[PDB]
């Protein structure tokens, strides 16, 4: 079945917080039809498949996420299933067209190396950029704390997107760094 939107990570007002906008029973049904009537808002969504929950990010008219979450699934829209606009397995990438209601982020051009990852829990965790696809956390966390966050953006200190969270670098079960698909790598895909 189709990937379904089931909430959003908000940074609209002042505070960073999750907003579940759908329940579970009524997930495994919209995922049958792919007709999502529910109101969608803003940049960072929570989407789910039957088995998994993870994030997805809109940057200039494309809702991006990870292929390792979404597989080759359509997404649910008010008009039916919306086919993937972009599907790179190697990168771990999947793009659809930005769903209706949404906002979209602006792609980062300031080349700052201070960044901010956004987990499914509404935590905006500091990350110092460390080259190409990678960043180091200022305060390491256990892996489990970040599972379900793939698809969320890394932001720069002015609101723009630098990439999309892909994987976490762990030893001992502890994450001191992460792997993301940089924005330069997205428009290359387009
Ligand atoms: C903090 C959680 C973290 C963000 C999450 N990502 C992962 O867990 C990924 C998925 C998988 C293993 N991942 C990892 O993070 C591992 C892990 C040991 C688990 C820390 N880390 C790791 O390999 O480190 C190595 C240095 C990097 C080398 C690069 C790794 C390659 C990345 C990757 N690519 C592809 C492309 C296609 C695939 O086809 C199906 C599959 C893939 N799988 C991949 O990695 C997540 O939250 N997921 S999620 O939301 O819970 C789930 C619902 C969706
Ligand atoms: Zn920037």
Numbering used by the authors: 990 to 1179
Paper text:
The HCV NS3/4A protease – a chymotrypsin-like serine protease – is a prime therapeutic target that cleaves four known sites along the virally encoded polyprotein. The NS3/4A protease also hydrolyzes two human proteins, TRIF and MAVS, which are part of the innate immune system, thereby confounding the innate immune response to viral infection. In this study, we report that four chemically representative protease inhibitors – telaprevir, danoprevir, vaniprevir and MK-5172 – exhibit distinct susceptibilities to the protease variants R155K, A156T and D168A. To elucidate the underlying mechanism by which chemically diverse inhibitors bind to the wild-type protease and drug-resistant variants, crystal structures were determined for 16 inhibitor-protease complexes. These complexes include wild-type protease and resistant variants R155K, D168A and A156T each bound to telaprevir, danoprevir, vaniprevir and MK-5172, with resolutions ranging from 1.10–2.50 Å; S139A protease variants were used except for telaprevir, which requires covalent bond formation with the serine 139 for efficient binding.
Telaprevir potency was slightly better against D168A relative to the wild type, while danoprevir, vaniprevir and MK-5172 lost 100- to 1000-fold potency against D168A. Among the macrocyclic drugs, danoprevir and MK-5172 retained higher activities against D168A (D168A IC50 = 48 nM and 13 nM, respectively) relative to vaniprevir (D168A IC50>400 nM). Unlike in the danoprevir and vaniprevir complexes with wild type, in the MK-5172-wild-type complex the P2 quinoxaline moiety did not stack on R155 and interacted less with D168 and the electrostatic network involving these residues. Thus, the single-site mutations R155K and D168A only caused very subtle changes in the MK-5172 binding conformations. This subtle effect is reflected in the small loss of potency against the R155K variant; however, MK-5172 exhibited 100-fold lower potency against the D168A variant, likely due to less extensive interactions with D81 and K136 relative to wild-type and R155K. Overall, analysis of the four crystal structures explains MK-5172's significantly retained potency against R155K and D168A as well as its loss of potency against the A156T variant due to the rigidity of the macrocycle. Unlike other inhibitors, MK5172 does not directly interact with R155 and D168, which mutate to confer multi-drug resistance. This unique binding mode of MK-5172 explains its significantly greater potency against R155K and D168A variants compared to other inhibitors.
